[PDB]
Amino acid sequence: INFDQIFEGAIEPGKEPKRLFKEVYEGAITATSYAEILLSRAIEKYGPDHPVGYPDTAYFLPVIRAFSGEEVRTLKDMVPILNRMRAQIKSELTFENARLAGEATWYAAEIIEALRYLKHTPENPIVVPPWTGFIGDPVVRQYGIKMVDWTIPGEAIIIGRAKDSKAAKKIVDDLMGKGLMLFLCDEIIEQLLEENVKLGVDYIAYPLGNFTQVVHAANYALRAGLMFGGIAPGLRDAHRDYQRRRVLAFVLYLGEHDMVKTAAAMGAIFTGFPVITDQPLPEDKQIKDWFISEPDYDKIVQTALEVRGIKITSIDIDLPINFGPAFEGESIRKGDMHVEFGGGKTPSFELVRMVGPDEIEDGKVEVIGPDIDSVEPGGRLPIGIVVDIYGRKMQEDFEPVLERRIHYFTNYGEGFWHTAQRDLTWVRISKEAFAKGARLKHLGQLLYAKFKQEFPSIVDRVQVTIYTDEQKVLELREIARKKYAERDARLRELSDEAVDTYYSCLLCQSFAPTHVCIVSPERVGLCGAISWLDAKAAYEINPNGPNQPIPKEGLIDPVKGQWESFNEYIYKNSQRTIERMNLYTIMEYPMTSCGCFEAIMAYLPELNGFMIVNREHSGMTPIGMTFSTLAGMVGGGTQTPGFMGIGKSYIGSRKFVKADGGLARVVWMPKDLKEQLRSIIEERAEEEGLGRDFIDKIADETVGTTVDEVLPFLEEKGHPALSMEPLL
Numbered sequence: 156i157n158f159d160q161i162f163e164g165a166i167e168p169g170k171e172p173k174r175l176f177k178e179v180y181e182g183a184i185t186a187t188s189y190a191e192i193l194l195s196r197a198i199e200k201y202g203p204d205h206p207v208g209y210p211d212t213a214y215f216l217p218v219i220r221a222f223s224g225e226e227v228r229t230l231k232d233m234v235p236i237l238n239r240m241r242a243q244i245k246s247e248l249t250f251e252n253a254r255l256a257g258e259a260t261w262y263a264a265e266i267i268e269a270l271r272y273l274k275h276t277p278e279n280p281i282v283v284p285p286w287t288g289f290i291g292d293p294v295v296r297q298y299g300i301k302m303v304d305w306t307i308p309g310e311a312i313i314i315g316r317a318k319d320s321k322a323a324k325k326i327v328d329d330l331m332g333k334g335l336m337l338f339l340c341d342e343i344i345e346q347l348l349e350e351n352v353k354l355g356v357d358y359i360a361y362p363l364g365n366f367t368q369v370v371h372a373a374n375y376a377l378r379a380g381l382m383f384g385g386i387a388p389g390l391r392d393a394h395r396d397y398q399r400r401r402v403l404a405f406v407l408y409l410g411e412h413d414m415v416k417t418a419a420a421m422g423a424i425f426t427g428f429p430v431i432t433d434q435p436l437p438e439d440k441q442i443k444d445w446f447i448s449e450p451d452y453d454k455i456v457q458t459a460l461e462v463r464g465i466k467i468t469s470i471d472i473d474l475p476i477n478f479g480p481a482f483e484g485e486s487i488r489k490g491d492m493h494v495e496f497g498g499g500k501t502p503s504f505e506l507v508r509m510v511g512p513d514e515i516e517d518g519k520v521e522v523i524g525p526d527i528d529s530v531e532p533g534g535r536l537p538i539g540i541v542v543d544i545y546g547r548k549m550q551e552d553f554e555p556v557l558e559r560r561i562h563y564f565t566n567y568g569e570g571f572w573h574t575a576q577r578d579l580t581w582v583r584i585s586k587e588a589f590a591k592g593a594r595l596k597h598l599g600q601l602l603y604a605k606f607k608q609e610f611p612s613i614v615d616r617v618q619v620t621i622y623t624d625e626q627k628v629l630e631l632r633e634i635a636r637k638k639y640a641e642r643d644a645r646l647r648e649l650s651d652e653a654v655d656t657y658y659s660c661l662l663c664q665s666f667a668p669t670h671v672c673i674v675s676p677e678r679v680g681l682c683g684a685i686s687w688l689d690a691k692a693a694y695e696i697n698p699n700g701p702n703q704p705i706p707k708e709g710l711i712d713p714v715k716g717q718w719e720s721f722n723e724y725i726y727k728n729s730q731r732t733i734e735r736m737n738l739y740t741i742m743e744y745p746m747t748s749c750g751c752f753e754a755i756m757a758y759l760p761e762l763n764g765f766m767i768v769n770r771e772h773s774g775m776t777p778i779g780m781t782f783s784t785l786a787g788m789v790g791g792g793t794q795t796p797g798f799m800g801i802g803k804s805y806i807g808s809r810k811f812v813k814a815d816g817g818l819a820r821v822v823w824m825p826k827d828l829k830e831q832l833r834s835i836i837e838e839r840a841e842e843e844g845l846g847r848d849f850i851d852k853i854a855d856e857t858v859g860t861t862v863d864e865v866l867p868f869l870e871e872k873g874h875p876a877l878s879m880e881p882l883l
């Protein structure tokens with residue numbers, strides 16, 4: 156592995172950009188000096204052994220943990236590392252020395268930021284929303300699933316200042332509509348806030364802060380290799396290769412240059428991210444394909460996307476509102492809502508329906524009834540959405556799948572909002588979207604264009620009708636409810652036993668190459684979004700896609716759930732690292748995890764049972780670890796007996812770790828997680844004979860966070876797991 160080979164042709168000897176290299180050298184010396192003095196002052200004040208670190212991460216100082224592997228825990232640990240980084244800054248003006256200076260600048264910024272967080276407590280925070288500062292592991296994991304399928308095509312690290320706030324808003328709205336994840340640093344943030352651009356973790360656009368806070372992009376990106384990629388800490392070239400091949404990041408260096416910013420950009424180049432600046436560059440301050448100037452703001456985004464290799468697929472319908480992943484998570488407050496439909500205020504439904512060739516005119520979008528200019532701001536209308544689909548290869552069992560997509564298609568619109576499903580949908584449109592000209596016809600055109608782009612193989616013609624008359628919507632809701640009942644009846648017939656074929660899912664191998672998911676009718680994929688029916692429809696739509704049938708054959712262990720067919724498939728598709736997999740236990744040959752699991756279960760021998768912790772829970776767990784620390788062990792595609800990543804719904808399955816004792820073996824979950832699943836937990840517990848009140852016997856963080864606090868509660872509740880056989 157020779158990662159440096161990627162740089163081979165950038166600069167032919169005798170024509171080194173000595174202005175750039177000397178500015179990089181001065182900036183690296185300056186950053187390491189800043190860090191040296193701050194570290195010496197901090198060690199004098201707090202003492203060498205004083206702990207240092209970042210909130211809510213399993214990877215200590217992730218930049219150092221990835222590139223050199225040290226487990227920085229205290230101020231003392233930083234001292235040798237910085238010394239080494241200072242030693243590798245060399246006077247000679249070569250591209251290799253410049254990349255080493257950029258690595259040293261990244262190390263210095265990471266050290267300076269950890270020292271900054273020495274003063275940080277969650278209740279005396281040094282940063283407040285929308286600013287992020289250091290971004291916790293759960294956010295990285297929460298967006299990993301959008302990364303693996305390139306719903307997020309890439310990342311833009313924007314440092315400095317746009318020529319003015321309006322240019323900042325233009326390029327950032329453009330990037331947000333292309334779905335790129337943004338890291339913002341310095342005065343660009345205040346420029347965007349003055350223009351009322353939406354920023355924050357919910358919009359996948361992180362305002363890190365200023366100055367050394369830029370490093371919080373780097374320690375974010377490197378964690379992707381430490382998590383999903385399973386790369387060992389300290390494998391420097393392996394981490395750089397993972398970044399170059401999979402983290403499609405680039406830097407936009409806007410505004411007046413200064414030496415420390417240039418050295419940080421050189422560290423980005425050191426790990427394979429090109430830099431594009433809006434400044435004019437003399438020939439001796441540029442590197443082809445690595446440090447380049449695009450002064451014209453009309454071109455800078457496509458210039459960076461082309462040099463990085465990012466390919467964007469856009470629907471190219473002139474929507475009056477921005478559209479993309481950043482807006483999926485938005486919330487429209489009552490004060491900002493122009494109109495709403497459903498959610499128990501007006502009657503509502505949505506339905507996809509396969510139709511014959513006779514029936515439909517492709518591209519026809521019709522609004523039948525009053526449009527949203529009908530009402531005063533804050534008003535309401537009925538809405539019934541009917542998407543008729545004819546296709547040669549269309550099937551009725553695709554109807555629910557495509558219907559599921561409606562939610563997402565709606566939420567990506569800026570100022571469009573959607574929740575629930577079927578006849579319980581709740582839809583909202585903001586005053587801003589209305590002021591831009593958005594009307595119901597644009598929602599229908601959006602649904603049409605997205606369905607055409609996403610399922611070309613099976614939709615030959617698509618038509619969209621939006622009814623807003625109250626009694627007509629009430630009439631059509633009955634037809635939709637017939638379709639829903641047939642779908643529920645088809646789903647009821649599926650069991651692990653009744654079906655002869657389970658389905659693989661390899662979608663996450665783009666970031667977790669060794670990980671293989673096996674979806675069965677009673678075990679959803681650990682991301683929680685890929686059901687057995689979903690994977691089956693995806694394979695029938697794309698036979699050579701990442702979901703494949705696997706027959707249930709070669710049974711080895713009916714109890715733990717081991718079959719030769721799944722073992723073989725897994726061994727072949729895990730690169731011969733994983734030989735066996737039990738479907739019904741976590742204690743022996745558990746299914747592996749990539750890193751996007753909704754929750755983690757772990758066996759606690761002292762309580763004779765399982766703890767479960769979801770990604771959103773902040774707090775210690777009785778195993779003595781947080782969710783992030785546990786995910787550091789459970790993810791990365793290695794087999795971890797006694798630990799397993801799962802989707803939340805899987806807790807309600809009849810096959811839920813059935814060999815281990817199922818729900819009866821669960822002794823601890825977060826309160827909010829139990830409330831999220833209370834209904835299915837009560838139903839399944841009554842089915843098992845545990846009683847509907849069994850949920851009250853499960854300990855939570857209000858009971859305690861250690862074995863010593865939790866065991867007495869389980870003893871006083873008579874929890875059955877205490878009388879069950881120890882698992883191991």
Ligand code: SF4
Nearest residue numbers: 660663672680682685
């Ligand atoms: S089913 Fe497994 S492999 Fe597929 S997207 Fe979900 S977590 Fe990733």
Ligand SMILES: [Cl-]
Nearest residue numbers: 191192195196
């Ligand atoms: Cl000093």
Ligand SMILES: [Cl-]
Nearest residue numbers: 225226227232
């Ligand atoms: Cl150490």
Ligand code: NI
Nearest residue numbers: 749750751752
């Ligand atoms: Ni994952």
